[PDB]
């Protein structure tokens, strides 16, 4: 509309209405110029055997993008508590996005002193990739999302993508994308932008823990009418072979017939937080579970959803089977264990095999008068008819959705880092500053213009999500476990700022507190 | 549109699968867009 009028307002809050909760977040952003308005080809710079798994080919673009795909973007710690203590499940419904109060600044630097002024006629370009025609980078747990704390101003991350590569070289099948070749809306300082999005139907995330285990579903007072083989020999001696059968009952619950079995496993190596218990060797990469694709090895991370550890042992964690978050101010490389937060999937032990254990045993031969029965350990087990399992939990710091790859087939497309898998997830929102050239020469030149005015933009983003709730119906008599704050005195309030104004998140918070019968 | 009754397949303009340091009709590492070769219009055939 105009230079002196505001194109939007600040909306941050949650509205709890019945079975719906509506969250709204507003943040202030800053967008630089990336790559000097250039598309640039990029590839791994390394050589040798080590480079092999790390090889890539792709492009970086002048564009930035908006990422709201973490939960702490949309929920305060109190709202997340209010969610996870009272509800058995939740899921996103609608999405509403706004971009407003756009300001374009020009920077003239002379003799080491820089001046910043408004450029009132400059534009910023924005479009959403509604047709999912661009490579989709939002499901890779990247940085650059809206900050959890509403008072922080954040920088918009640069967009880039990878295409097919052989080592660091490309192939004829590799694709190049100009983002200028999409239609986009152009905004001066009075203009604003919005769009709305509709989540496709997904299952409720299961924010509850089971109060029964898959192997304990029987009535503890009654026998089965099934029999099992109790004895193959009468005793010590020669030629003692016999067949004896017993009823499965309360005394022996391990041999009873069951209708359902625990879910699939891919074994992880077990690491202790007590370092003297670990082996004195480097086994981080060498001893890691991995999968290979076209010759390259990828770590299995986090992998299939499995219980992090056995009951009573919390000092162990899967080598690359858990999500690990950094504490506030944690460095990038080779930080100690107290600098990171290792989450655990202990709640899913009821239906899921432990990550660091074998699935079970199988017979490896035929026993005979000349051959003893032999067994072997099942290190990995794929889906069997009759398996039941839980997905990975979601966290306040963790991702919300992922894009399901477009393929002939998939199974249980729920994404492995947690959250909601979608064939049409929330679309990517691309933004860049329109280049403003400096003064051209006075005689014509056919070369493209490499001289521009140094420029950046800033503004406000609001995002609104409607969430559907699934309320707890339980008949449990005794009280539940709840997520709660601790009363003990401390130098800081958790989930607040410190004396320097730095907001931190003390610990990762999962979703599973309330219980359900298995 | 091409109406042809030709049985055997046509010549088409196509990219080459062989690996290269650059994708044709893309930018290089410095951001320079180039056009590798001139491309004509005549591939499909018609009877004289």
């Amino acid at each position, epitope marked *: 509309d105009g230079v002196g009028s505001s194109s939007g307002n600040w909306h941050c809050d949650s509205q709890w209405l019945g079975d719906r909760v509506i969250t709204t977040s507003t943040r202030t952003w800053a967008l630089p110029t990336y790559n000097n308005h250039l598309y640039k080809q990029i590839s791994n*710079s390394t050589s040798g*055997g080590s480079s*092999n798994d790390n090889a890539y080919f792709g492009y970086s673009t002048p564009w930035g993008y908006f990422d709201f795909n973490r939960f702490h973007c949309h929920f305060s710690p109190r709202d997340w508590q209010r969610l996870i203590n009272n509800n058995w499940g939740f899921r996103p419904k609608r999405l509403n996005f706004k971009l407003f109060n756009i300001q374009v600044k020009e920077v003239t630097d002379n003799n080491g002193v820089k001046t910043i002024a408004n450029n009132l006629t400059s534009t910023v370009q924005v479009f959403t990739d509604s047709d999912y025609q661009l490579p989709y980078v939002l499901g890779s747990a990247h940085e650059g999302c809206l900050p959890p704390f509403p008072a922080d101003v954040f920088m918009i991350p640069q967009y880039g993508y990878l295409t097919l590569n052989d080592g660091s070289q490309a192939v004829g099948r590799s694709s190049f994308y100009c983002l200028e070749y999409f239609p986009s809306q152009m905004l001066r300082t009075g203009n604003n932008f919005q769009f709305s999005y509709e989540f496709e139907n997904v299952p409720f995330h299961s924010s509850y823990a089971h109060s029964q285990s898959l192997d304990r579903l029987m009535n503890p007072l009654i026998d089965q009418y099934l029999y099992y083989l109790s004895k193959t020999i009468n005793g010590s001696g020669q030629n003692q072979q016999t067949l004896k059968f017993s009823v499965a009952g309360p005394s022996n619950m391990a041999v009873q017939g069951r209708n359902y079995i625990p879910g699939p496993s891919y074994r992880q190596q077990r690491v202790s937080t007590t370092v003297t218990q670990n082996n004195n060797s480097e086994f981080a990469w060498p001893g890691a579970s991995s999968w290979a694709l076209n010759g390259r090895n990828s770590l299995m991370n986090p992998g299939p959803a499995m219980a992090s550890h056995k009951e009573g042992e919390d000092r162990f964690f899967p080598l690359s089977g858990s999500l690990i978050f950094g504490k506030q101010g944690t460095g990038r490389d080779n930080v100690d264990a107290d600098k990171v937060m290792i989450t655990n999937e202990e709640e899913i032990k009821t239906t899921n095999p432990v990550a660091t254990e074998s699935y079970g045993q199988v017979a490896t031969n035929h026993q005979s008068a000349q051959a003893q029965a032999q067994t072997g350990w099942v290190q990995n087990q794929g889906i069997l008819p009759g398996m039941v399992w839980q997905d990975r939990d979601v966290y306040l710091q963790g991702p919300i959705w992922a894009k399901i790859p477009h393929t002939d087939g998939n199974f249980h497309p729920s994404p492995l880092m947690g959250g909601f898998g979608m064939k049409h997830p929330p679309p990517q929102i691309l933004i860049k500053n329109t280049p403003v050239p400096a003064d051209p020469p006075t005689a014509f030149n056919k070369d493209k213009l490499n001289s521009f005015i140094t420029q950046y933009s800033t503004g406000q983003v609001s995002v609104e999500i409607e969430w559907e709730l699934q309320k707890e119906n339980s008949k449990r008599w005794n009280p539940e476990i709840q997520y709660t704050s601790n009363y003990y005195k401390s130098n800081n309030v958790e989930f607040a700022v410190n004396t320097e104004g730095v907001y931190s998140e003390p610990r990762p918070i999962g979703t599973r507190y309330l219980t359900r019968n298995l | 549109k091409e109406n042809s009754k030709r049985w055997n397949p046509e010549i088409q303009y196509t990219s080459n699968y062989y690996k290269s340091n650059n994708v044709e009709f893309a930018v290089n590492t410095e951001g320079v867009y180039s056009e590798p070769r001139p491309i004509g219009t005549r591939y499909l055939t018609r009877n004289l």
Partner: antibody
Amino acid sequence: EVQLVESGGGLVQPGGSLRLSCAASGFIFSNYWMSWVRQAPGKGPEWVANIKQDGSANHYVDSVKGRFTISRDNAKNSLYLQMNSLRAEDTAVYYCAREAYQDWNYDYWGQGTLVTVSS
Amino acid sequence: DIQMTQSPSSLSASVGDRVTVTCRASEFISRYLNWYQQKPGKAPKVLIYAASSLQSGVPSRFSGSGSGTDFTLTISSLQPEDFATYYCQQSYSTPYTFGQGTKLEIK
């Protein structure tokens, strides 16, 4: 089939600068990483530098950092090593090698040129 | 960087003998280990690359095994042509490093 030829070897006083050129006739030169390997007299060979198949990146061994520049011309199928501030230790036979695709070993080696740094 | 240690430094055997050379790595270099045979006045020639795999046009008597930090070069039915200096090199990371070398002697 694949031939690598090294030229420009010779004697130079210390602090002197020398340039080495490698010619490759037998293959697609732009698909491969190329290296420089030197073997001092009576010693095992030693890796000096490599350069990317398009020339975007390059690596050097610590001893020679800043004094040597590896360079690549894909149109002429030639590899160049630029040596500055030469030392007595530097004198060795210089080998031009091609790094194998995927495996990364030196599948092909040039005959090599002897380069002497003498007072 | 990574250090490569080759043993023994020198070895002497006779035609028909079985010779074994051991290479050790300071750090994990996976399967990226090569064995080079070198004769005076010539460049090193690759015999075995990527741990186990044999170079084409090389006799089947040369064999290689091992992964991670320990590798071994095995020669069965030794021949007069086989006497040379042998190097183990790691192509896993830069700077690429070579072993000290094992020299074989006529008996």
